[PDB]
Design a protein around this ligand. Structure first.
Ligand SMILES: [Mg+2]
Ligand SMILES: [Mg+2]
Lengths: 50, 553
């Protein structure tokens, strides 16, 4: 798991959805905090296999 | 079994007993330039733009007052703590710069002038960079440690003090390097990254100009204006020196802030950001990563203030409105305006950095703060979105150079030192001020069509070459500096040079709280806030050698 995923899941506001309304990945917008969807970070990580 | 432990050796490293060798000497040199491109941080750029929000030119921006907390505390002058992480950060970062210059200088001293005749010219460049860092430190802290013995061993550093020298003795040590660079730099640098003689002279003068506004007392207030200092500012701003370098004003004002015109004749000395160069993504100007507007996703910091937008208003003769500018906000259809505004602030309803395909508006696309901090966009460090010169790293950055000395500074500094000398040379300074003002009046490449498309009335006029009072010519000089250097982050440092810091910033705090409610409980403190606190971590690690600044105990 990438460094601090949980610690990123906990300071991401609950208003930000997991999925956007076309079915891609949710994220912030406008003034909401500069911080990425953890669930999407876990997806983009899922083949980094040693 | 002793051969066994000596057999492994370090991997991929020069050990600090081969660094002084001659084949690495120019390596130490280029290394010493790079940290100006590479040793800063979005929250601590070497433009010092973060610590220019304290002046009347700009806001912090961001999501709100919680986004970048320690910087909103500097904007309003309430809540700064000697322990804030950002003040400590910049103190350590600039002193990191001095490491590479002094390490270069250590190895340079042992070179044989017969085997290496560029020896003095590189000592010059290295001493020039040392003073660059020292100057910015002084602007930020005033009571600084002078680290200019490059033959100091490392443990000798625990005994250094920031009161070893008096304030005027400090500034002379900064001067003393710039003074060297002048005497040994060649007049033309075909490699534009290195300063020429003219640059060191420009910088020698600037330093004596800050040095002349004496603070010889225990506090930060003025204790006099030295004429021997001002007589040096005039000396090294001589156009004869400058002409030897090929330096001068550009045709159009916007040329100094566009990638297509790097290192023209006004870039007296600059930091050479670059792309497509082997580095991981840079060498971009990463330090301005917060200032890119919301339209790129993030982050909307370093916004111009209305007090700056209105300061570009002009009367019917094209002169500024010294006594009445800030009363009514600039109305595009009615009032006359200085062209310099449309290369400094990007306003709603106007093309963002000259790209008509991006019209700034008042919406979630342009203000991250829903208008808390306004809808203006600094333009002197952003670029065209369509630029091939703009990459996305952690934050968004360009390769647009950073001009430390523009040449308009050489002229306005010269004018100030003539006006304050009041030896009857004030009409030669009004001729300088006009050079800068006449240029801008005509600087309408890229915004010529703004008259018929958006309704903009350009009118800027030079002053009539007559007799003027000192106190009046110092008003005309401050205003030229005000419009000419908007958002370029010499602002607050000017008000502290002039000793007006308290009065101007408090007045601004009042006038502007009706327009940006973060300024509503602001209060500057005379004899405390003209400088930053010596950082607590740094005092505390000195074990008694560092004195704090006045008004912080
Ligand atoms: Mg301010
Ligand atoms: Mg460049």
């Amino acid at each position: 798991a990438p460094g601090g995923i949980i610690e990123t899941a906990l300071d991401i506001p609950s208003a930000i959805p997991v999925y956007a309304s076309d079915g891609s990945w949710g994220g912030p917008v406008g003034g909401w905090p500069d911080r990425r969807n953890p669930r999407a970070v876990l997806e983009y990580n899922k083949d980094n296999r040693y | 079994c002793d051969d066994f432990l000596d057999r492994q050796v370090p991997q991929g490293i020069v050990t600090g007993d081969q660094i002084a060798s001659p084949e690495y000497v120019d390596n130490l040199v280029i290394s010493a330039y790079a940290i100006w491109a590479t040793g800063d941080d979005i929250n601590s750029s070497f433009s010092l733009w973060n610590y220019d929000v304290r002046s009347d030119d700009c806001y912090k921006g961001g999501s709100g007052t919680e986004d970048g907390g320690v910087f909103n505390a500097l904007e309003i002058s309430k809540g700064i703590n000697t322990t804030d992480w950002n003040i400590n950060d910049i103190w350590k970062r600039l002193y990191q710069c001095i490491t590479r210059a002094n390490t270069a200088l250590q190895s340079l001293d042992q070179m044989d002038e017969k085997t290496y005749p560029l020896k003095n010219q590189r000592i010059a460049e290295m001493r020039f960079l040392r003073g660059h860092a020292h100057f910015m430190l002084k602007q930020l802290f005033k009571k600084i440690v002078i680290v200019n013995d490059e033959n100091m061993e490392p443990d000798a550093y625990n005994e250094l003090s920031n009161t070893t020298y008096t304030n005027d003795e400090q500034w002379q040590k900064i001067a003393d390097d710039f003074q060297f660079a002048y005497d040994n730099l060649p007049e033309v640098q075909i490699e534009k990254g290195r300063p020429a003689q003219a640059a060191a002279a420009a910088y020698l003068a600037k330093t004596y100009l800050y040095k002349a506004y004496r603070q010889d007392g225990a506090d930060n207030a003025l204790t006099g204006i030295n004429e021997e200092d001002l007589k040096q500012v005039v000396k090294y701003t001589d156009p004869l020196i400058m002409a030897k370098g090929g330096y001068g004003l550009e045709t159009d004002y916007s040329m100094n802030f566009l990638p297509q015109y790097e290192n023209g004749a006004e870039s007296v000395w600059a930091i050479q950001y670059s792309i497509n160069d082997g580095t991981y993504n840079g060498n971009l100007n990463w330090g301005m990563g917060l200032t890119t507007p919301q339209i790129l996703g993030c982050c909307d910091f370093h916004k111009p203030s209305q007090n700056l937008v209105n300061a570009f208003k002009t009367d019917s003769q094209g002169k500024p409105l010294f006594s009445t500018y800030d009363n009514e906000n600039y109305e595009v259809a009615t009032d006359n305006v200085d062209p310099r505004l449309f290369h400094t602030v990007g306003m709603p309803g106007f093309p963002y950095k000259y790209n008509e395909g991006y019209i700034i508006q008042k919406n979630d696309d342009w203000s991250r703060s829903k208008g808390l901090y306004g809808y203006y966009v600094s333009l002197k460090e952003n670029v065209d979105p369509d630029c091939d010169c703009l990459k996305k790293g952690s934050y968004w950055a360009s390769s647009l150079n950073h001009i430390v000395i523009r040449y308009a500074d050489v002229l306005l500094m010269r004018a100030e030192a003539l006006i304050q000398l009041n030896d009857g040379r004030i009409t030669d300074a009004i001729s300088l001020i006009n050079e800068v003002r006449s240029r801008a009046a005509g600087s309408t490449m890229l915004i010529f069509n703004y008259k018929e498309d958006y309704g903009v009335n350009f009118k800027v006029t030079p002053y009539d070459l007559k007799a003027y009072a000192q106190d009046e010519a110092m008003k005309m000089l401050k205003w030229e500096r005000r419009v000419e250097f908007g958002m370029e982050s010499s602002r607050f440092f000017d008000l502290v040079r002039w000793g007006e810091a308290k009065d101007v910033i408090n007045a601004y705090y009042v006038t502007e709280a009706s327009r940006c409610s973060i300024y509503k409980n602001a209060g500057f403190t005379e004899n405390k806030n003209e400088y930053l606190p010596v950082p607590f971590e740094q005092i505390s690690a000195s074990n008694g050698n560092y004195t704090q600044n006045f008004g912080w105990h």
